[PDB]
């Protein structure tokens, strides 16, 4: 599913993402936007290390979900990477919360650092009623 901006903002808000571990809804929107252009079936294979990024948040198979084909990988979200390719984002949100429960927080995603950190992200939630 390809989410429309404001539709996604309210979806994330209803799932408990606004301020989760101090991360505003605008930051999560900026992350999904730059990671997948709001696309739940987005995927990116990393030929360099045999891992794959899955879904709207592009969560990596090496540590967060199991796809059965990444060497010595773990599954901290206790999910099949397939769960991260559903139109319903509940499972992807539960995993994203798990990622940020670690030391780096939202910084776990390099793209957040490159295009969201120290930027004006207000535009992502403006007019969404969140």
UniProtKB/Swiss-Prot annotation:
InterPro entries: Glyco_hydro_22, Glyco_hydro_22_CS, Glyco_hydro_22_lys, Lysozyme-like_dom_sf. It catalyses: Hydrolysis of (1->4)-beta-linkages between N-acetylmuramic acid and N-acetyl-D-glucosamine residues in a peptidoglycan and between N-acetyl-D-glucosamine residues in chitodextrins. The keyword Signal applies. Keywords: Amyloid, Amyloidosis, Antimicrobial, Bacteriolytic enzyme, Disease variant, Disulfide bond, Glycosidase, Hydrolase, Secreted, Signal. The keyword Secreted applies. Residues 1-130 form the C-type lysozyme domain. CDD domains: LYZ_C. One of its GO terms (biological process) is killing of cells of another organism. It is found in: Secreted. Disulfide bonds join 6-128, 30-116, 65-81, 77-95. GO terms for cellular component: azurophil granule lumen; extracellular exosome; extracellular region; extracellular space; specific granule lumen; tertiary granule lumen. GO terms for molecular function: identical protein binding; lysozyme activity. Pfam families: Lys. The active site is at 35, 53. Its EC number is 3.2.1.17. Monomer. Belongs to the glycosyl hydrolase 22 family. Lysozymes have primarily a bacteriolytic function; those in tissues and body fluids are associated with the monocyte-macrophage system and enhance the activity of immunoagents. It is linked to Amyloidosis, hereditary systemic 5: A form of hereditary systemic amyloidosis, a disorder characterized by amyloid deposition in multiple tissues resulting in a wide clinical spectrum. AMYLD5 primarily affects the viscera, and the predominant clinical features are renal dysfunction of varying severity, and intra-abdominal bleeding. Inheritance is autosomal dominant. Lysozyme C is capable of both hydrolysis and transglycosylation; it also shows a slight esterase activity. It acts rapidly on both peptide-substituted and unsubstituted peptidoglycan, and slowly on chitin oligosaccharides. This is Lysozyme C.
């Amino acid at each position: 599913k390809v989410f429309e901006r404001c539709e996604l903002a309210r979806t994330l808000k209803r799932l408990g993402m606004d301020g989760y571990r101090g991360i505003s809804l605008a930051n999560w929107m900026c992350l999904a936007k730059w990671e997948s252009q709001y696309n739940t079936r987005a995927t990116n294979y990393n030929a360099g290390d045999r891992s794959t990024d899955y879904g709207i948040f592009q969560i990596n198979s090496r540590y967060w979900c199991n796809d059965g084909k990444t060497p010595g990988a773990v599954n901290a979200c206790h999910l099949s990477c397939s769960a991260l390719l559903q139109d319903n984002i509940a499972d992807a949100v539960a995993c994203a919360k798990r990622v940020v429960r670690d030391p780096q927080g939202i910084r776990a995603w390099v793209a957040w650092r490159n295009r969201c950190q120290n930027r004006d992200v207000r535009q992502y939630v403006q007019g969404c009623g969140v």
